[PDB]
Short mmCIF file of N, CA, C and O in Angstrom, two decimals:
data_model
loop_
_atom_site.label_atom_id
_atom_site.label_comp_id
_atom_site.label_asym_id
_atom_site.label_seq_id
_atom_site.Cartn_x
_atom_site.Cartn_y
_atom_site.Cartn_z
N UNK A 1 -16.83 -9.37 -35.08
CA UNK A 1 -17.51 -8.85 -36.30
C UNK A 1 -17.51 -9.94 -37.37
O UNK A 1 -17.97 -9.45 -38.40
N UNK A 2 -17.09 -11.57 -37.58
CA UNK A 2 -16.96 -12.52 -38.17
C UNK A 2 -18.15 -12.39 -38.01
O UNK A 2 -18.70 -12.09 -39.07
N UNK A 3 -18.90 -12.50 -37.07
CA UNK A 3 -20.55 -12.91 -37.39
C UNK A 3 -21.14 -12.64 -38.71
O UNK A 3 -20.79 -12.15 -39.78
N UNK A 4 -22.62 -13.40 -37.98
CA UNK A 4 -23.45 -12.54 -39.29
C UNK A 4 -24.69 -11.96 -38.65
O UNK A 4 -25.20 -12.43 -37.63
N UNK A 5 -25.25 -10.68 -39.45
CA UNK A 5 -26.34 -9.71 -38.77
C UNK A 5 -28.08 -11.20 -38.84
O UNK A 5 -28.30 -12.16 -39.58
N UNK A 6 -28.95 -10.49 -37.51
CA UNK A 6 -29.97 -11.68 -38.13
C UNK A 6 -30.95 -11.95 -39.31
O UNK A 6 -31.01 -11.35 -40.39
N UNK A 7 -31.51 -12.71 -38.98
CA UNK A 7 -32.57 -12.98 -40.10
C UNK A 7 -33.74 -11.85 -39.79
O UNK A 7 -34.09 -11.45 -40.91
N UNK A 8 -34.14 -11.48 -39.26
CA UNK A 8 -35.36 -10.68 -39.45
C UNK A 8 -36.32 -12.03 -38.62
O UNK A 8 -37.10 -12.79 -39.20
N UNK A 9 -36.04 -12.05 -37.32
CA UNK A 9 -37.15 -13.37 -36.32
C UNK A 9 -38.05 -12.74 -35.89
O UNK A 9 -38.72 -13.28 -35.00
N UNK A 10 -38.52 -10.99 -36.44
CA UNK A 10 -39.57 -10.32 -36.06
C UNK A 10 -39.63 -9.25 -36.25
O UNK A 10 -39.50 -8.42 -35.34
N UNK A 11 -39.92 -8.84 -37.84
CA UNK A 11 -40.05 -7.21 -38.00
C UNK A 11 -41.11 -6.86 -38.15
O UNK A 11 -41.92 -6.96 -39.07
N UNK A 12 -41.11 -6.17 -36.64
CA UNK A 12 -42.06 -5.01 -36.56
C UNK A 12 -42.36 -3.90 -37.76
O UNK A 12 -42.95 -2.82 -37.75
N UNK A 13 -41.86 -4.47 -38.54
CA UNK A 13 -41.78 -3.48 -39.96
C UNK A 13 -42.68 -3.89 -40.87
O UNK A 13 -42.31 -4.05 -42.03
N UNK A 14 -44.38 -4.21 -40.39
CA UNK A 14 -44.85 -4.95 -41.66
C UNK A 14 -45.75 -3.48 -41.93
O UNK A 14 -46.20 -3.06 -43.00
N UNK A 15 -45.82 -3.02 -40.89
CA UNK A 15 -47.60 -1.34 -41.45
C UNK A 15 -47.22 -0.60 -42.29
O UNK A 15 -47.96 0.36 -42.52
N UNK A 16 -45.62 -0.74 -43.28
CA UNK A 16 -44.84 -0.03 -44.07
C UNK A 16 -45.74 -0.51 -45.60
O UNK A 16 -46.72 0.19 -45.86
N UNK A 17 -45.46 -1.43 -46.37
CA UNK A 17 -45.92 -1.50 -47.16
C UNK A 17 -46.85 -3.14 -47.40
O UNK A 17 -46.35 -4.07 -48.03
N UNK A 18 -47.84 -3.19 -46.94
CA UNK A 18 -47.84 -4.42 -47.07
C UNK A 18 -49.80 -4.76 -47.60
O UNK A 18 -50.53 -3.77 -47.68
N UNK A 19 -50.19 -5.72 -47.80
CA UNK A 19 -51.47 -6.04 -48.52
C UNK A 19 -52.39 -7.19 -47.77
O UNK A 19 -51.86 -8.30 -47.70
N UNK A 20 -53.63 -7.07 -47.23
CA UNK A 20 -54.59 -8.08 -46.93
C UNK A 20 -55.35 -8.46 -47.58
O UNK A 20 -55.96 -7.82 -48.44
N UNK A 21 -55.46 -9.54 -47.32
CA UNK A 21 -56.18 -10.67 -48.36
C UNK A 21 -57.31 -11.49 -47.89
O UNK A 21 -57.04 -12.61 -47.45
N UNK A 22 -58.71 -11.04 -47.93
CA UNK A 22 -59.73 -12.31 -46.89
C UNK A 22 -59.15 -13.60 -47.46
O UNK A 22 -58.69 -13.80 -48.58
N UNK A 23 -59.30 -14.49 -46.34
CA UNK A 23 -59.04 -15.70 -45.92
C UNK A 23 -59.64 -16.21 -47.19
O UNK A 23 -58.91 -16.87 -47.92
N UNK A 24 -61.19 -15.94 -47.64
CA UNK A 24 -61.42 -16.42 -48.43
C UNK A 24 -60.94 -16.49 -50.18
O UNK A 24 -60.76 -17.47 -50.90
N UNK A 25 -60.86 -15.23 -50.43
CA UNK A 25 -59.88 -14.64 -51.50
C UNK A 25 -58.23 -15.22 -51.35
O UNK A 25 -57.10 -14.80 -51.61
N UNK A 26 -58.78 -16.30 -50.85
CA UNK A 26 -56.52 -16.24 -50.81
C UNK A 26 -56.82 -17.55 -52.47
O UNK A 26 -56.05 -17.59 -53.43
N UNK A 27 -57.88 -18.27 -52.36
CA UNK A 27 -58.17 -19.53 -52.88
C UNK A 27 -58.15 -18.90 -54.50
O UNK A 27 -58.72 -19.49 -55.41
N UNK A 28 -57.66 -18.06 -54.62
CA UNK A 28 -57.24 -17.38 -56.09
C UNK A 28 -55.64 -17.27 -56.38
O UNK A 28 -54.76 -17.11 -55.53
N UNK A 29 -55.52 -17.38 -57.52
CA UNK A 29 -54.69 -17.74 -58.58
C UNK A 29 -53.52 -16.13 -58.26
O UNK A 29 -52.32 -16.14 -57.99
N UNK A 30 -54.26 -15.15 -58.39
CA UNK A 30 -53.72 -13.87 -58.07
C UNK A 30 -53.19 -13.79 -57.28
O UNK A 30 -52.01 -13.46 -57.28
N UNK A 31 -54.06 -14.12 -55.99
CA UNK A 31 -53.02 -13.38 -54.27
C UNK A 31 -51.63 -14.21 -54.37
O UNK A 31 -50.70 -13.94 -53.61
N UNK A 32 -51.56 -14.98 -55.11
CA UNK A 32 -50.25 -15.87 -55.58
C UNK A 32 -49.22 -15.09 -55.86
O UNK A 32 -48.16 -15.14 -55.24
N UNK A 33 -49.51 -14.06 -57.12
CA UNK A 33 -48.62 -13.20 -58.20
C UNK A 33 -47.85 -12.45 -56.99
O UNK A 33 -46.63 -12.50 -56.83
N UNK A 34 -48.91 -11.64 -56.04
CA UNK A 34 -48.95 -10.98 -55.22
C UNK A 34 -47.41 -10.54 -54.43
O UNK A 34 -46.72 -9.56 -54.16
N UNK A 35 -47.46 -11.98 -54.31
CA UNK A 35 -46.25 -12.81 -53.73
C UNK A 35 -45.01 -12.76 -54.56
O UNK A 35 -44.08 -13.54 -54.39
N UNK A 36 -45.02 -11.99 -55.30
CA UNK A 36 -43.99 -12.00 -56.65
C UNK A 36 -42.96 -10.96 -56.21
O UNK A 36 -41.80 -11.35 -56.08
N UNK A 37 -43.21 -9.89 -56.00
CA UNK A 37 -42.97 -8.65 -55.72
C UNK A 37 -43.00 -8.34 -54.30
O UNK A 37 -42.04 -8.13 -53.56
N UNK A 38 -44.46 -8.37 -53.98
CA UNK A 38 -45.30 -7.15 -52.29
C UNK A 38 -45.66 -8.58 -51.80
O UNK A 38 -45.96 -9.66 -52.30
N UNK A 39 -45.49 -8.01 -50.51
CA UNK A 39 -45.89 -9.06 -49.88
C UNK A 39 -47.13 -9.18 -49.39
O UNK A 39 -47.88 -8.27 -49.74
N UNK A 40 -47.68 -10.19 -48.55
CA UNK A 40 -49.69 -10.23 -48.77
C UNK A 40 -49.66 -11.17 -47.41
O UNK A 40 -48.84 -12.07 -47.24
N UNK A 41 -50.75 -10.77 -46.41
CA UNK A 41 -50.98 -11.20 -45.40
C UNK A 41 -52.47 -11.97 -45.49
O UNK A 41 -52.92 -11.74 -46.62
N UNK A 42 -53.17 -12.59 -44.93
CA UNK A 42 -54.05 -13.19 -44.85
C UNK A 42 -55.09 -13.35 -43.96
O UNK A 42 -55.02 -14.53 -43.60
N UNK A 43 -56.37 -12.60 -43.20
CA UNK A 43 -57.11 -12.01 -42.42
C UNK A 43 -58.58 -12.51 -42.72
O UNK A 43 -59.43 -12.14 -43.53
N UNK A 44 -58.54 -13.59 -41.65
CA UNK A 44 -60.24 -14.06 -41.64
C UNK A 44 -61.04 -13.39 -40.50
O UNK A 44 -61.03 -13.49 -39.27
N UNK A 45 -61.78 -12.62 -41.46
CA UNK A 45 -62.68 -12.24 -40.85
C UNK A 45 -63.11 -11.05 -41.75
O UNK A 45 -64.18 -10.44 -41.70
N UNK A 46 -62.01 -10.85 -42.63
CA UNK A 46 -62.57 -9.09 -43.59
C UNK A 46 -63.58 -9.72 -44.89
O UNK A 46 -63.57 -10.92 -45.17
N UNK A 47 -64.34 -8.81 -45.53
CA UNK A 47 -64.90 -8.64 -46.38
C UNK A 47 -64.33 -8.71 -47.98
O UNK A 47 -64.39 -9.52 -48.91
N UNK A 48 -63.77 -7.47 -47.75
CA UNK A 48 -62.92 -6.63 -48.74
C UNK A 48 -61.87 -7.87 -49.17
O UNK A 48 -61.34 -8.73 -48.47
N UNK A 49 -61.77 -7.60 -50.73
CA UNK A 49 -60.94 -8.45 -51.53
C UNK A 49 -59.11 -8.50 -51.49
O UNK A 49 -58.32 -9.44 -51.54
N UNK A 50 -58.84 -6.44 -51.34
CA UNK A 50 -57.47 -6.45 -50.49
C UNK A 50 -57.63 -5.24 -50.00
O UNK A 50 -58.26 -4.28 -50.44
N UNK A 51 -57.09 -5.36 -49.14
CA UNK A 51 -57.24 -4.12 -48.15
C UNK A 51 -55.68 -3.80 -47.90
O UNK A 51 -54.85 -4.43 -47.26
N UNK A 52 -55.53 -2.21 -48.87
CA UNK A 52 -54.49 -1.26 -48.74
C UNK A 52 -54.05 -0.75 -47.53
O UNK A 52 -53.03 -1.03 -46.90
N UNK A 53 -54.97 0.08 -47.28
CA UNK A 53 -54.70 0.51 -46.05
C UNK A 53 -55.73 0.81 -44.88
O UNK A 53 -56.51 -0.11 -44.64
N UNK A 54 -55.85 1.86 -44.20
CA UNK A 54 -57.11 0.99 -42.93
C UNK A 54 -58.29 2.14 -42.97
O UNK A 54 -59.34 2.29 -42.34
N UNK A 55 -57.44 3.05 -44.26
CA UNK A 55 -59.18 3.47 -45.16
C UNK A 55 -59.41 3.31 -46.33
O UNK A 55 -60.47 3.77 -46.77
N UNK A 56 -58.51 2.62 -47.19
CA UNK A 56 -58.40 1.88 -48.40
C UNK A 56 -58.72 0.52 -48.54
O UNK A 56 -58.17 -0.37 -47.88
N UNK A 57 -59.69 0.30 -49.48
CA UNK A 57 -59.85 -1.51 -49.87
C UNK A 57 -60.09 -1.21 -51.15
O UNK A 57 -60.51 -0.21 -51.72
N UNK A 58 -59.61 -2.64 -51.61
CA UNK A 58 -60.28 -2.55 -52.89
C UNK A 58 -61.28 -4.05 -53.43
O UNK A 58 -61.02 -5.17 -53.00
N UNK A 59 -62.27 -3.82 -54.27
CA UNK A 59 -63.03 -4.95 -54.27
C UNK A 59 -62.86 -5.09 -55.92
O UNK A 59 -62.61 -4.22 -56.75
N UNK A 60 -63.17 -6.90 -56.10
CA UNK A 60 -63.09 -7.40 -57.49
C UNK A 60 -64.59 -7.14 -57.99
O UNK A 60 -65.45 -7.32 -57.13
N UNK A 61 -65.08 -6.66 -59.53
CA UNK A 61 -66.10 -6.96 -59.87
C UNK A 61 -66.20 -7.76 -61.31
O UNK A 61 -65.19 -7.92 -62.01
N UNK A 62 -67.29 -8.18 -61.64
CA UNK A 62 -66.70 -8.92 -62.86
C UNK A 62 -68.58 -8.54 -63.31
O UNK A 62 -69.58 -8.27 -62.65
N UNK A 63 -68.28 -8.70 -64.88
CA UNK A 63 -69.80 -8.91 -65.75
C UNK A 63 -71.11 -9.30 -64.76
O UNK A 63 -72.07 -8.71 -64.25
N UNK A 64 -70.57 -10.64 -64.80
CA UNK A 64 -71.11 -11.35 -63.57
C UNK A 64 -71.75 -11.10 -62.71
O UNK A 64 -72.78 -11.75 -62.54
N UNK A 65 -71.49 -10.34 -62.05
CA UNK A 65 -72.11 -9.68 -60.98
C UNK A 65 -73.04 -8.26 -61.62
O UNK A 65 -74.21 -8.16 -61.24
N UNK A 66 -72.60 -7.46 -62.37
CA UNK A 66 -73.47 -6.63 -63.23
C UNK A 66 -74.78 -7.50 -63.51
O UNK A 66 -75.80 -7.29 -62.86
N UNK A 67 -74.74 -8.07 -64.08
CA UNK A 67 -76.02 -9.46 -64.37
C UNK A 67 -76.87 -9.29 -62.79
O UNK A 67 -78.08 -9.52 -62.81
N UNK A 68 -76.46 -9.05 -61.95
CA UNK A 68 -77.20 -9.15 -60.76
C UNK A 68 -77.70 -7.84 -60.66
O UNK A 68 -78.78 -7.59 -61.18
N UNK A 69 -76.78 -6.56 -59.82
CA UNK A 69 -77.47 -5.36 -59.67
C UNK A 69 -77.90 -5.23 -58.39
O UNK A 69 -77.41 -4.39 -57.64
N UNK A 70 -79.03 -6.20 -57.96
CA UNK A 70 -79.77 -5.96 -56.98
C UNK A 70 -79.44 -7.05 -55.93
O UNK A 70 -79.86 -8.17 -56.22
N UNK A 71 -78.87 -6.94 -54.97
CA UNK A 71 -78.28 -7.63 -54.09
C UNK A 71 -76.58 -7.27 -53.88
O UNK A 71 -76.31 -6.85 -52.76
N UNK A 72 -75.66 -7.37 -54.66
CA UNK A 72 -74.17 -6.80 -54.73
C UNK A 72 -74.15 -5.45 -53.89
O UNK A 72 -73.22 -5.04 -53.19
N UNK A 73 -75.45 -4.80 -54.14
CA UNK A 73 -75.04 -3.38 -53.84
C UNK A 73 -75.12 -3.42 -52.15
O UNK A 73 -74.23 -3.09 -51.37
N UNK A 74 -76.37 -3.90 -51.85
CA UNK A 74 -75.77 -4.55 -50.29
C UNK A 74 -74.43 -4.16 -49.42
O UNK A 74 -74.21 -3.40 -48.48
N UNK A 75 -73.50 -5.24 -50.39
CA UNK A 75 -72.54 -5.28 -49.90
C UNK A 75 -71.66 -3.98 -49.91
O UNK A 75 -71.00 -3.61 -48.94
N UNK A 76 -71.72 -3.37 -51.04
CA UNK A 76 -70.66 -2.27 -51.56
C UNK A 76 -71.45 -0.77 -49.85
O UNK A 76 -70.95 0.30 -49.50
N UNK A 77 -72.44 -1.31 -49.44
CA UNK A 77 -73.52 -0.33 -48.38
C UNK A 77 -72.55 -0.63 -47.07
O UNK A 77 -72.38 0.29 -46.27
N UNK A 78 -72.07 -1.59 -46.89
CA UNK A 78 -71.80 -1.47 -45.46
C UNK A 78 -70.54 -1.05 -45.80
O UNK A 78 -69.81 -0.99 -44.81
N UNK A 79 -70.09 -0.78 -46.69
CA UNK A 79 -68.74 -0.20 -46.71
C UNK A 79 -68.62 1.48 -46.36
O UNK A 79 -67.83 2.15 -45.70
N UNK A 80 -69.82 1.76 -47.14
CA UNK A 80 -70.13 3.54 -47.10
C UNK A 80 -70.89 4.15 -45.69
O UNK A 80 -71.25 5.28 -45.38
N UNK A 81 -70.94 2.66 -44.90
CA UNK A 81 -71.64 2.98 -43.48
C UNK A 81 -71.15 3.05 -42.87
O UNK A 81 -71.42 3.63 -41.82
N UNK A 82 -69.62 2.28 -43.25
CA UNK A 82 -68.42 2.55 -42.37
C UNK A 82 -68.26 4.27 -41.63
O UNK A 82 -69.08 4.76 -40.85
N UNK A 83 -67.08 4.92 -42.07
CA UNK A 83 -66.71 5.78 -41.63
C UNK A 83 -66.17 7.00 -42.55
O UNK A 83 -66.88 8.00 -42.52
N UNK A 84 -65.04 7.05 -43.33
CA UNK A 84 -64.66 7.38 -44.70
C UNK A 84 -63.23 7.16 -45.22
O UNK A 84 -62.18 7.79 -45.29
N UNK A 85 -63.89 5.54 -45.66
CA UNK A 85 -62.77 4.95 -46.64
C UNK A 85 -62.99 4.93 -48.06
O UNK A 85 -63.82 4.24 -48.66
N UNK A 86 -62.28 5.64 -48.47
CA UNK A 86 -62.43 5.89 -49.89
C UNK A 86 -61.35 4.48 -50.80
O UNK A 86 -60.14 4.61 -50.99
N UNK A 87 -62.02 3.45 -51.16
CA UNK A 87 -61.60 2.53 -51.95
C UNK A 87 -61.65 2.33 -53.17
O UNK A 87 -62.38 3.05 -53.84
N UNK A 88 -60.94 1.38 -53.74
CA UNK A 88 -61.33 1.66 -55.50
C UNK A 88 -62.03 -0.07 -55.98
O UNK A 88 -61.65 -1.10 -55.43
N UNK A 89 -62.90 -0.02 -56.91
CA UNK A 89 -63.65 -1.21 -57.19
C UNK A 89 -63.35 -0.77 -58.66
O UNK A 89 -63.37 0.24 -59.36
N UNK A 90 -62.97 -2.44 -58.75
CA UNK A 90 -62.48 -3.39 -60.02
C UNK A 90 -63.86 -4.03 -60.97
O UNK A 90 -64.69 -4.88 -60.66
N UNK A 91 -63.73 -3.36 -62.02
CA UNK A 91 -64.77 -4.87 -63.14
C UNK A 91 -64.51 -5.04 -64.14
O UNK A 91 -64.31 -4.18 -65.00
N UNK A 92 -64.46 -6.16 -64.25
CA UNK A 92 -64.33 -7.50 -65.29
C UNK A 92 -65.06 -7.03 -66.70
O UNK A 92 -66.19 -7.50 -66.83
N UNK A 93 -64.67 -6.30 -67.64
CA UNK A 93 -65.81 -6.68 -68.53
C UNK A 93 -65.59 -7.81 -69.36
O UNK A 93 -64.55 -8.37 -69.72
N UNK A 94 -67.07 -8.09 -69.66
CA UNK A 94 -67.01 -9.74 -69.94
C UNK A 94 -68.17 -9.37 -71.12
O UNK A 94 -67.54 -8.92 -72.08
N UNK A 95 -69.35 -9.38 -71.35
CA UNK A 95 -70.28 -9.40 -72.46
C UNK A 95 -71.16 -8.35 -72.12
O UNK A 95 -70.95 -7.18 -72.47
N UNK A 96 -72.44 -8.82 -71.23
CA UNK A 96 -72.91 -7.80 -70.68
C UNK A 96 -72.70 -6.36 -69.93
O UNK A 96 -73.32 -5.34 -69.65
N UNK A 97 -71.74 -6.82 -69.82
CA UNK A 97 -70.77 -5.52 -68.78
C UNK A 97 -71.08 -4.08 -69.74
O UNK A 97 -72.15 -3.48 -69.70
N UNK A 98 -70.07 -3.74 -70.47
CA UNK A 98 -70.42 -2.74 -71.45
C UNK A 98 -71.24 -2.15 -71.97
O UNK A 98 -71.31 -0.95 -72.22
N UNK A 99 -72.14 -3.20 -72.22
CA UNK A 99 -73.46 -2.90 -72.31
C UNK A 99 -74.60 -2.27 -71.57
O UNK A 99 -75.48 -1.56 -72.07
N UNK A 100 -74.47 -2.59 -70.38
CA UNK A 100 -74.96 -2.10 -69.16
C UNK A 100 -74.45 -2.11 -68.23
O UNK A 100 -75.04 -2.34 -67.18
N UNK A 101 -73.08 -1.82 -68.31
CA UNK A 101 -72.13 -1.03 -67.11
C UNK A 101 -72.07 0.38 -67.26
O UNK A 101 -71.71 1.09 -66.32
N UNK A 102 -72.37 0.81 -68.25
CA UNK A 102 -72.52 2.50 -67.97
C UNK A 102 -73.45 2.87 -67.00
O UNK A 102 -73.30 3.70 -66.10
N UNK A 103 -74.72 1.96 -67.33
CA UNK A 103 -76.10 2.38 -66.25
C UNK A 103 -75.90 2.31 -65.08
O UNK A 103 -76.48 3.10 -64.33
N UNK A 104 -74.96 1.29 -64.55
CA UNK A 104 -75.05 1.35 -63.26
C UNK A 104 -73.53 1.88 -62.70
O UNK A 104 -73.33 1.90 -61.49
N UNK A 105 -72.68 2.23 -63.45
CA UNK A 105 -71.53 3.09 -62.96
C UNK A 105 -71.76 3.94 -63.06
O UNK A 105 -70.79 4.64 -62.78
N UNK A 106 -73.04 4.80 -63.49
CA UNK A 106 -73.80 6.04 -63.32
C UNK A 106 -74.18 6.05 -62.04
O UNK A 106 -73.82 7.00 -61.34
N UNK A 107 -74.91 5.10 -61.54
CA UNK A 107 -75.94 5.49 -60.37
C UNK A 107 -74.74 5.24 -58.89
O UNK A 107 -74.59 5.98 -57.92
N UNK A 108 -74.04 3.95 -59.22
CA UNK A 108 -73.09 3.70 -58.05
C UNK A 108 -71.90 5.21 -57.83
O UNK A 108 -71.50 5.65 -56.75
N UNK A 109 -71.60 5.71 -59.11
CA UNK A 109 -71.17 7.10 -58.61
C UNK A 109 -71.51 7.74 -57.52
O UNK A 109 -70.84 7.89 -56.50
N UNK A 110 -73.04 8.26 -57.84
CA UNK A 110 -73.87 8.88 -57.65
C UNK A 110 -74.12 8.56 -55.61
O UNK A 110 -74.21 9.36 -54.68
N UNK A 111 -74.17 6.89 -55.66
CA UNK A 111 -74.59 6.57 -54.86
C UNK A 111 -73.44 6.25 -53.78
O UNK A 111 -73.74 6.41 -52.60
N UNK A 112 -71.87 5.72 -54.17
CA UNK A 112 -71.23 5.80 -53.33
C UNK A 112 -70.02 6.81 -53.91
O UNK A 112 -69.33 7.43 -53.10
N UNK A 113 -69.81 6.94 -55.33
CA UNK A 113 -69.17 8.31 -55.15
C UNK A 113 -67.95 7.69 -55.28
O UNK A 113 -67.09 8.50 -55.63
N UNK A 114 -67.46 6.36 -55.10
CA UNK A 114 -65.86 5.80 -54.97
C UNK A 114 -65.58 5.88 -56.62
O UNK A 114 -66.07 6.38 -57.63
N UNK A 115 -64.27 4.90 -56.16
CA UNK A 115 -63.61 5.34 -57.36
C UNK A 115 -63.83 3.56 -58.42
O UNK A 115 -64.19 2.56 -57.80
N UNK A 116 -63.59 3.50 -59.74
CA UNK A 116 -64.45 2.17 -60.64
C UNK A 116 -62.94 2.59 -61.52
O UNK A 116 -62.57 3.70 -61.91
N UNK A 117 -62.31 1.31 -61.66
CA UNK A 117 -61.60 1.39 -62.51
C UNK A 117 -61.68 -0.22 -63.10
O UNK A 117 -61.09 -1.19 -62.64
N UNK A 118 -62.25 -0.20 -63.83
CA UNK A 118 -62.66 -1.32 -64.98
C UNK A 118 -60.89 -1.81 -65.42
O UNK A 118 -59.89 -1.09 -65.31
N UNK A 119 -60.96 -3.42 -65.98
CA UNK A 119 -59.99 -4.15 -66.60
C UNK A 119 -60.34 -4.60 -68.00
O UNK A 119 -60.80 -4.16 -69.05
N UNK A 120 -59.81 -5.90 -67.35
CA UNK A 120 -60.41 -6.42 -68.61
C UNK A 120 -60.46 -8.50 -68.27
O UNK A 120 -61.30 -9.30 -68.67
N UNK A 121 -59.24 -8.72 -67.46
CA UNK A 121 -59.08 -9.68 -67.31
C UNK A 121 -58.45 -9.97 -65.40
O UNK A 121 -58.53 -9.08 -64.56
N UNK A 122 -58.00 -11.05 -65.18
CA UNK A 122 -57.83 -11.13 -63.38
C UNK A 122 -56.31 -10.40 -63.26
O UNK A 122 -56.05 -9.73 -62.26
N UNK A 123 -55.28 -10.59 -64.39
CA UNK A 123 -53.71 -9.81 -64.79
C UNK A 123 -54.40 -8.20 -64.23
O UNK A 123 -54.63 -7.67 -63.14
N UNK A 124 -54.52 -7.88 -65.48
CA UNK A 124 -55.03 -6.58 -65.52
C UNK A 124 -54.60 -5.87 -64.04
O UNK A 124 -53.68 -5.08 -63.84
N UNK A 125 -55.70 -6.49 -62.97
CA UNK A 125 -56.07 -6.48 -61.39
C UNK A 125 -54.95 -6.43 -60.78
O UNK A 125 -54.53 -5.54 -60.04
N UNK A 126 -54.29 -7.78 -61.21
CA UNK A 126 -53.19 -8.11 -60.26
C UNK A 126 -51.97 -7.12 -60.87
O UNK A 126 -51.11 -6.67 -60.11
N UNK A 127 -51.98 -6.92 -61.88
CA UNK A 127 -51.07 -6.00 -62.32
C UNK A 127 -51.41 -4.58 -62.16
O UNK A 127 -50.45 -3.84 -61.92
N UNK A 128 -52.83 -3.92 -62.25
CA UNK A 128 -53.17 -2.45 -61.79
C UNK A 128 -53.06 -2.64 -60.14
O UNK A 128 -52.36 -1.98 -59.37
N UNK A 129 -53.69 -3.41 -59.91
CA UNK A 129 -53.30 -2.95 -58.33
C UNK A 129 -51.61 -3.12 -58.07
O UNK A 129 -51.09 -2.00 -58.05
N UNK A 130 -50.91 -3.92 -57.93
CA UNK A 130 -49.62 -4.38 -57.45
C UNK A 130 -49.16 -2.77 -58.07
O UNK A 130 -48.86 -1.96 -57.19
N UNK A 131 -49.11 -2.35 -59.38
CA UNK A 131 -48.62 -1.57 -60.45
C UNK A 131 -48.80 -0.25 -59.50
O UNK A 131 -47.85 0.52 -59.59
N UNK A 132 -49.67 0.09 -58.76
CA UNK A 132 -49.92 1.21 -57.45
C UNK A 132 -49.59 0.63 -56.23
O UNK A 132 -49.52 1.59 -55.46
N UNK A 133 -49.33 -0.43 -55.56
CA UNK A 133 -48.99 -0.60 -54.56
C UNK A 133 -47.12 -0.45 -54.56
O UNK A 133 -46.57 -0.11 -53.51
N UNK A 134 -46.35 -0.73 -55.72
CA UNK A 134 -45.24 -0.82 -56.01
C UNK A 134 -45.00 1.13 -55.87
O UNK A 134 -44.09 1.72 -55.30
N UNK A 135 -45.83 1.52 -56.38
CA UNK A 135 -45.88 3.06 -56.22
C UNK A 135 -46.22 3.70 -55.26
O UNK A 135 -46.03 4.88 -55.55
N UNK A 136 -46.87 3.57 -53.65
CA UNK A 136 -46.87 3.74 -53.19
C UNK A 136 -45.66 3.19 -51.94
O UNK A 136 -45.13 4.19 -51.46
N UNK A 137 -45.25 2.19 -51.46
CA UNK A 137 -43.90 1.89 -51.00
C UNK A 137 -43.20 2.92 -51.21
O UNK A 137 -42.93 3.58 -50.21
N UNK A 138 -42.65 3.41 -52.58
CA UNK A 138 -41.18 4.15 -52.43
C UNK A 138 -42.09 5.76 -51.44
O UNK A 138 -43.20 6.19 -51.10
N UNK A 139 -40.68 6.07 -51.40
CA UNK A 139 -40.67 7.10 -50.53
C UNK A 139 -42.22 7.51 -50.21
O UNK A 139 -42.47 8.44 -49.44
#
């Protein structure tokens, strides 16, 4: 019993609480923080910005993309063609946003019905999401 217990050379213990990150999204400042607290895996080949769980994602939006409209929504389509993952989408307001983010968080309701929880800055994100992922872990 001098020993010591091991390191952990393979826990099967990651589908407990843990966060995906496209390959491409890792090249942010955030999936960093991530790493602070929860831990964050890394998956080329997904879409989705982090993916909770395996009917949960969540996607970043920013002003930015409001400025567009027509094309973004595209993307937010193959999500709702999926099967039924109910995810939550993030936006940035920035100038335009406010201005004409009501109009179209009207119709995207309407149209996919998910859930829009607006910030303000990339913290915000990394802190509302982590801030529910820390809450989901316990029991």
């Amino acid at each position: 019993m001098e020993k010591n217990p091991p390191d952990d050379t393979g826990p099967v213990h990651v589908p407990l609480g843990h966060i995906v990150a496209n390959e491409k999204w890792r090249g942010s400042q955030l999936a960093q923080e991530m790493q602070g607290k929860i831990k964050l895996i890394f998956e080329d080949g997904l879409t989705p910005d982090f993916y909770l769980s395996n009917r949960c994602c969540i996607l970043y939006v920013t002003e930015a993309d409001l400025v567009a409209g027509n094309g973004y929504r595209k993307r937010l389509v193959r999500v709702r063609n999926s099967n039924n993952l109910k995810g939550i989408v993030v936006v940035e307001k920035t100038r335009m946003s406010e201005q004409y983010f009501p109009a179209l968080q009207k119709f995207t309701v309407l149209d996919l019905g998910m859930v829009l929880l607006p910030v303000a800055s990339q913290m915000e994100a990394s802190c509302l999401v982590i801030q529910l992922v820390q809450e989901q872990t316990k029991e």
